[PDB]
Design a protein around this ligand. Structure first.
Ligand code: I7E
Ligand code: I7E
Length: 9
């Protein structure tokens, strides 16, 4: 999940 969201940054 972390990667899925982190892509924003
Ligand atoms: C630790 C998080 C998931 C916030 C992150 C990892 C790698 C690049 C950007 C964010
Ligand atoms: C340090 C960066 C943000 C390049 C990173 C750490 C862990 C996973 C993916 C990227």
């Amino acid at each position: 999940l972390a990667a899925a969201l982190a892509q924003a940054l």
